[PDB]
Amino acid sequence: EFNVVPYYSWFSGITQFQKGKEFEFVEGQGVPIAPGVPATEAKGYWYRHNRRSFKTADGQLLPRWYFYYLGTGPHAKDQYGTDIDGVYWVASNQADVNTPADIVDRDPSSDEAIPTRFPPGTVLPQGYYIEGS
Ligand SMILES: Nc1ncnc2c1ncn2[C@@H]1O[C@H](COP(=O)(O)O)[C@@H](O)[C@H]1O
């Protein structure tokens, strides 16, 4: 949850459930599927939301990552592929990463998030759960 309204991702998040496993994709992979989007526009980044829990007298949420098309979201101005903590860049090999994706953001009610799905052959990062799946 957010005490500051986030930029809305077109897609459901990917949640870490095993500590220690790194968030990664093979180069050319990792852009979630949206109907009608040309592969030339399949470029962007996953952004890590660190989550924080409140203290109890019991006994820790792990991060959840959200996808943003290139030139959108909280890192809209950062260059593709730049080392930034909490940003993981992904792109189809059809995409030119020197230009922002031609994709207006999501919301209001207008559209709900698309459950995150990847094409056959995608190496899925172990230790992460794709929300919606
Ligand atoms: N920065 C964000 N933080 C939390 N939720 C977001 C964010 N951007 C968009 N959303 C939408 O809120 C829902 C949470 O994602 P998920 O719970 O993993 O299914 C998703 O449908 C998101 O796309």
From TrEMBL:
Subcellular location field: Host cell
Residues carrying Phosphoserine: 109
CoV N NTD domain span: 6-132
Main subcellular location: host cell
UniProt keyword annotation of Repeat present: no
UniProt organism field: Human coronavirus OC43 (HCoV-OC43)
GO cellular component, one term: viral nucleocapsid
Name used for this protein in its record: Nucleocapsid protein
